Amino acid sequence: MRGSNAPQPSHISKYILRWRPKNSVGRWKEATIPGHLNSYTIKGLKPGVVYEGQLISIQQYGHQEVTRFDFTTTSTSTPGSRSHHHHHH
């Protein structure tokens, strides 16, 4: 409605998902996701291996935003940390 025409400086043409295991400082694996998706199922990740990840959003204006993230880092391997020994109420 009302045209809604505006050069919004936030239009992604493609998302590049780059991941590489911490045991490798070599090449990153690259997967390109269409610039209208918000999730990707990465196949080829080793279980129990720390990975480096980079989400590069290529915007139509040639604007590149690289969001660096990590995987296999949130290891909730709590060895039964019982601190509860006081009954409330």
Binding site: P9, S10, I12, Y15, L17, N38, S39, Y40, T41, I42, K43, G44, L45, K46, P47, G53, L55, S57, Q59, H63, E65, T67, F69, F71
Partner: peptide, 30 residues
């Protein structure tokens, strides 16, 4: 350098549903 002072940078992607060799990585685009 940090040229992008505008908030058109995707927030930290969330990794859910971890399989043996696959994940679901979800990101929020501006």
């Amino acid at each position: 350098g940090s040229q992008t002072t505008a908030p058109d940078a995707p927030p930290d992607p969330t990794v859910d549903q971890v399989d043996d060799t696959s994940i679901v990585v979800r990101w929020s685009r501006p």
